[PDB]
Amino acid sequence: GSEEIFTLQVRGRERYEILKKLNDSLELSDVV
Amino acid sequence: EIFTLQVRGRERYEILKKLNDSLELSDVV
Amino acid sequence: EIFTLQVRGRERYEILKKLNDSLELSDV
Amino acid sequence: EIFTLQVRGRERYEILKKLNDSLELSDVV
């Protein structure tokens, strides 16, 4: 097998929100 | 302010890591 | 509603294309 | 070596521009 879980530490709320939206997008689209 | 972002999959992690590290260096946001 | 983004370099393009394609699909 | 991305929507475009600009600035040896 299964995909493993990895964690990224992000500094800044605006930066986090962008990266979260990308992560969530990729989960839905499965592009990566 | 520090957050954790939990990512499924090594390839997905690698793309987000590249972006995070880039943003830390550039300070664009 | 369509905007052109100029990107320098293949690796940079390939990253951003993956994201753009993903966002097109997850835009619900 | 210029590529173009067609991005639909202001908000999406603004995110991808920030990332592009960041990756240009963090492109260091």
Numbering used by the authors:
A (entry chain C): 300 to 331
B (entry chain D), D (entry chain A): 303 to 331
C (entry chain B): 303 to 330
From the paper:
SEC-MALS showed that the truncated domain remained tetrameric at high micromolar concentrations, with the tetramers partially dissociating at low micromolar concentration. In all three structures, DRp53(302–331) forms essentially identical tetramers with orthogonal packing of primary dimers as observed for the full-length tetramerization domain. The last turn of helix H1 partially unwinds in the truncated domain, and in some chains, the C-terminal carboxylate group of Val331 folds back onto the tetramer and forms a salt bridge with Arg314 from an adjacent subunit, thereby displacing Asp229 that normally interacts with the arginine. Analysis of the salt-bridge patterns in different tetramers further revealed that Glu326 (Glu349 in human) can adopt alternative conformations and in some chains interacts directly with the guanidinium group of Arg314. This observation of fluctuating salt-bridge partners in the truncated zebrafish domain supports molecular dynamics simulations on the human protein, suggesting that the stabilizing Arg337-Asp352 salt bridge is part of a larger fluid salt-bridging cluster that includes Glu349 (Lwin et al., 2007).
The tetrameric transcription factors p53, p63, and p73 evolved from a common ancestor and play key roles in tumor suppression and development. Surprisingly, p63 and p73 require a second helix in their tetramerization domain for the formation of stable tetramers that is absent in human p53, raising questions about the evolutionary processes leading to diversification. Here we determined the crystal structure of the zebrafish p53 tetramerization domain, which contains a second helix, reminiscent of p63 and p73, combined with p53-like features.
